[PDB]
């Protein structure tokens, strides 16, 4: 409580606010990180008017701080985004994600013989080299990828 | 007579282009006028002894609208011939004894051409031989350009794919060499590269040609696309999977496409040209396919046929 | 034109009672005077991913005493079709770019009636598809039930067998529900009883049915016997054995039958009709079977052609 | 103004307002509708209070008007849904969601050996009101079934 | 000698109270003190006419925990006996020639009692024999419900899935029948029902039974939840679909089971019980498969050896 | 205990130089004295979800030449496990109640490293995982290796054949760089040359390495020579035979080796080296395929045995 409006909708107490998301970014979050999967009030401002970029998503979770590696998480999605973290209508965190070492469970092995397609196995990827562009091994079958062909299905 | 009369359709090398030409002209006829009794009591033998569906029955239906009966076998599934060692010089000389033509498949390279030393007087058209030819699946490739094209010569015509292996992409760049100034664009996983041979044949024509590797390059200039099958066992799971999946076609890449264009495949198609592709007015493959009808009866007609009254 | 003019058969449940009574009208005149340069010109395609050389070998003469060509494939048996990742939407748009009807049977329900978005404007006339549909097995049985018995109304039918997983049975109740006043029996093994989904659809209409455990409580009353093939897989050795196999038909069980009573059969039938049961004047199963050509001929008249002269 | 109410809910000017969706539908409509695909200002609110009826969520989908037939595919979903449109700063209509004739796309058939499962074809169900529930019967195989065993699978 | 020196252990029914008590008393023992060089010197032959890999390397593994040796076989179409031609009867009488005991699997009921009347003293010990008997997995579930809940008296316990056909839960219920006080609840889909054979036998002991739908309706009392797998190939697809909202186990459904409640099942478990289930305390079909290998090193101990004193 | 002692044997990245030296290191002292009562009471499972059998008896051996006992099986299409309904999940967590070491072969690539998280306390070696690795070959190599030339160090190494899809020669380049001034030679026809990750990985460490095209041209400097075979499958016919005067041995290739040089193969070797190589002293093929026997006798007893005071 105070003032929200939309252009830049406001203040939830306590809670996490990432916002600058890409744009249409917002929606791959909830979907594959399952931050809706909660009972807290949770509001959205998708496709809004701002600061360079034009138009960005936004996500407010309040009563849930994520962070240090769910934070991270997001990298490879929405790697400026900030993750303003918010306690008694004053943020009193503010972090930007870096690349993990490790993605589990959110992508897919690309290599078709992979086992892990067929099994009770979450997925899992080393990370490696920053931002030249990203290469991602899996866990079980060993074989590296380009990020972007992951990435695409 | 006709120059094809009488001749066994074995090789794509030795149709002229007079000939390419001739085949053509009367598929156009018969599309337009067609002539439903024109081999009436000829019988034809279609041999298939690899399994091929999609081929045959265009070839049987082909030879059903003009008239012929159809006696014949698929095979990979057990029809007991080359049991008990029966050669096929053997099995030739003796289908040639009672059919008016023999239309054949075969795995081994070269097995159309020997049943042409056997076969007598009876035509051997062939529908493939291995790795080898093809010549019906280039005539009404062809036919397809001609027809959407209005002309075979002039054309930048892009091969995208597994170059190296597919039999139809190598004998149609030898057939449109027969014409002039066509340029070609090559797009291929480096593992999956158009042939030496093909190259040096292009080169010492004075055709030209290029090597790209995204389609995004060529689209504007590019008047037929002849997409194809890369299958999954000439490169391993994750190579196919890799940064290599993306010779395909998908509907925003056609956006700066020439009004004319058209994406041509001889199927089948798995994912290489993504379903919205369809709806577009530049898709043709399947219309390519139903003009293997013509290109097939006017191959039939034109060899069982002295003089062809068009 | 005909109301069935270019109209896709694939369900029983898509024929009115005007369309049913039109089929069968004409199977009467094409069986009283034939019609065999009909379908003159005409190709049909014989699709047969499943096999069932019974019913393809009755379609397909059906065809033949038409006039038409047929080109086609019978399979589990590789004819390599659905090879390399082939869709069955893909096989048919190319099927339809030279066929003038497609006649196909499928192991999974549904696929006769995706053909249809596919087919462009040639027929597809679903010869079955997994346990769903069979019209053309219906369309056989109703044509010898009026033929026999003069009508197809105010009958009192028996069904006998496996209810539950016998398709045939499951549409032919559909069809006889189309129809006034008809009385059912069934008779079942208990682990084989007629589906709640059909009982609820009967009582829905006002329509009688009762259940029986013996064909002798049901006899004197009963003109049409459909009996039915109980396959051993459905039960277990022991059970097919124990007291449930005693739905089998015998000729001393017809004593008290009437004149008119007529005992029908799918087909094959292994020992549910015992053979004596043929010499009888009721046994009418092979002369229906015979009937799968007139009702078959007359589905592909009316489909193929506008104003059909009588 | 406070009983919180909203803090001051961005009256969207023009659009779609979606209410009353019944607590975690919200973001399946999301998904299955693909409300997202599309450039327009939405705003969404999940685990709202319903201190009226229930716990709520609400989309508001800025100058988009979402009808007929689109209102009554939601019927399967948030049966105690009220769309309201709005044209400049208040309602201008009410609906609410009614049972269709067909429910096309989103559903699967029940049936493994159906067509429909293997090929490009977009699913469509019959709806049927057997009172005590709603069957739904597929278009491909014909088989009706409970409207509960389809929205699992 | 121990009750059990040399018999054959063909079915539960010939086994009394006190026999499989003796069982259970000598597998916790073994469990507990291994004896390793117990049957040095021994041959087992593992004849298993149908194959089944897991039963197959659970007794294998207690034979050689035992210290025996292990000649044998699995047939799945290749490896000659049996042929037809040779008897089951002469294998048996040759292979008893060459080994000290017989553990073997065949397709046909009562292969393993046909056996016994050929092997002269060799004993044998049936590991499935058709849709009959298969005592040493009664044998292991009786171990797993007496090592979990303390006793095999006065338990609540439910049985579900494919009732009318799943082998080891007709089996379960005679011998969980020989003990007191046992209340029964049978879950199943009513195609799929206990058969009244198994019912009727309950009722003559005076035993208390019910039947229920879901797991649901009984999560609460129970002790041993016992899991089939349903069979879908004695169902149609559509069937199998449509009950209730299934009887399949998820974690959800267990926040209402008794703390020392447990979830068995025989494996394999496609889909049945979720992987949620697996990570909770009322898990224990693994631990169940573990303790095979000491219900069969019992049964091998108890035949093999006169006395045993451990 | 030992650094490998309940370890798995999963992947040669996995291993460190320090790892794979102990284990050279113990295999010499097992190949000089024997241990035959070393993992007696031990039970270990064979399973070959693909089949091998040279991999398959090499181990078995090793597991016997050590006293443990084997369960286990092989499977080309036949016997049960794994399914499709079974999980490979479920199949492990099974098995690691009946075992105490599992060694697998399975087509899929991880499938080994899946089993790991099933396991429990069981260790599980692998045997080969589709196209990823294959430890135990590349230890026996090293140990060939080793025992010929006296060093891993400061070598030069030919590798020649299908370097593309070579597992054996990927892991092998792997582990001969954990040590230091290894020369490596590839000798590979283009489309099948040794992939820019090994490549890569080499220029990291600095290593020195050259691509030849025919061995003829580093016969001379080399010490080991480590043929692979070309899959014909993989290649077409003619591409097949249209390379140099190929890339296969023969003695007279030889006549230029340096005295200590070795001919390394994994087998099976079709033609790639001829008859006439066996004969000289550069043969050293089948001593490599004797010296599995001691180097996975060397892995099963690190890995089950805390302390080896041999
Ligand atoms: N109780 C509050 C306080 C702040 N915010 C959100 O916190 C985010 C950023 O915090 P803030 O540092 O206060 O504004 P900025 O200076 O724009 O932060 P930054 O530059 O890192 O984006 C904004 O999206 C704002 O909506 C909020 O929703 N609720
Ligand atoms: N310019 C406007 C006007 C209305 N609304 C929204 O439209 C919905 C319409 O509800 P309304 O008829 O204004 O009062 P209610 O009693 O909430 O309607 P209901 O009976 O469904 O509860 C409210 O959620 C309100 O936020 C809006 O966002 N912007
Ligand atoms: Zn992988
Ligand atoms: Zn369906």
Same mark, same amino acid.
């Given at each position: ?82 993750? &303003?973290? =918010?306690?008694?209508? #004053?943020? !009193?965190?503010? +972090? ?7 993605? *589990?469970?959110? /992508?897919?092995?690309?290599?078709? &013989?992979? =086992?892990?397609?067929? #099994?009770? !196995?979450?997925? +899992? ?7 030249? *562009?990203?290469? /991602? ?12 062909? !992951?990435?695409?299905? | ?310």
């Amino acid at each position: 409580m105070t003032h929200d409006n939309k252009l830049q909708v406001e203040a939830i107490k306590r809670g996490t606010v990432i916002d600058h998301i890409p744009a249409q970014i917002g929606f791959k979050l909830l979907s594959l990180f399952k931050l809706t999967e909660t009972d807290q009030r949770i509001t959205i401002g998708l496709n809004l008017p701002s600061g360079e970029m034009g138009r960005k998503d936004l996500i407010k979770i309040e009563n849930t701080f994520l962070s240090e590696d769910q934070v991270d998480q997001l990298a490879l999605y929405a790697p400026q985004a900030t993750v &303003n973290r =918010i306690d008694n209508y #004053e943020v !009193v965190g503010k +972090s930007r994600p870096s690349l993990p070492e490790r993605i *589990d469970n959110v /992508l897919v092995c690309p290599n078709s &013989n992979c =086992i892990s397609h067929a #099994e009770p !196995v979450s997925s +899992s990827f080393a990370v490696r080299k920053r931002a030249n *562009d990203i290469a /991602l091994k899996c866990k079980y079958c060993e074989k590296e990828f380009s990020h972007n062909v !992951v990435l695409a299905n | 007579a006709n120059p094809l009369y009488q001749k066994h359709i074995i090789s794509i090398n030795d149709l002229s282009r007079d000939d390419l030409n001739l085949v053509l002209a009367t598929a156009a006829k018969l599309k337009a006028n067609p002539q439903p009794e024109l081999l009436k009591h000829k019988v034809i033998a279609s041999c298939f002894f690899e399994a091929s569906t999609r081929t045959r029955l265009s070839f049987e239906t082909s030879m059903h609208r003009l008239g012929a009966s159809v006696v014949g076998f698929s095979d990979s599934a057990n029809t007991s011939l080359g049991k008990k060692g029966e050669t096929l010089a053997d099995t030739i000389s003796v289908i040639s004894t009672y059919v008016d033509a023999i239309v054949m498949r075969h795995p081994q390279e070269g097995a159309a051409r020997l049943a042409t030393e056997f076969s007598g007087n009876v035509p051997v058209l062939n529908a493939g031989d291995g790795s080898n030819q093809h010549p019906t699946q280039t005539l009404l490739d062809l036919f397809t350009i001609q027809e959407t094209q209005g002309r075979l010569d002039n054309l930048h015509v892009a091969m995208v794919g597994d170059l190296k292996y597919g039999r139809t992409v190598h004998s149609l760049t030898q057939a449109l060499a027969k014409f002039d100034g066509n340029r070609f664009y090559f797009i291929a996983p480096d593992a999956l590269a158009m042939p030496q041979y093909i190259l040096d044949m292009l080169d010492e024509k004075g055709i030209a040609w290029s090597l790209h590797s995204s389609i995004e390059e060529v689209m504007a200039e590019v008047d037929i696309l002849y997409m194809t099958r890369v299958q999954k066992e000439r490169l391993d799971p994750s190579e196919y999977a890799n940064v290599k999946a993306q010779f395909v076609l998908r509907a925003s890449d056609l956006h700066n496409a020439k009004a004319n264009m058209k994406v041509l495949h001889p199927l089948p198609r798995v994912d290489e040209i993504a379903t919205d592709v369809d709806k577009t007015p530049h898709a043709w493959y399947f219309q390519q396919a139903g003009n293997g009808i013509f290109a097939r009866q006017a191959l039939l007609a034109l060899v069982l046929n002295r003089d062809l009254v068009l």
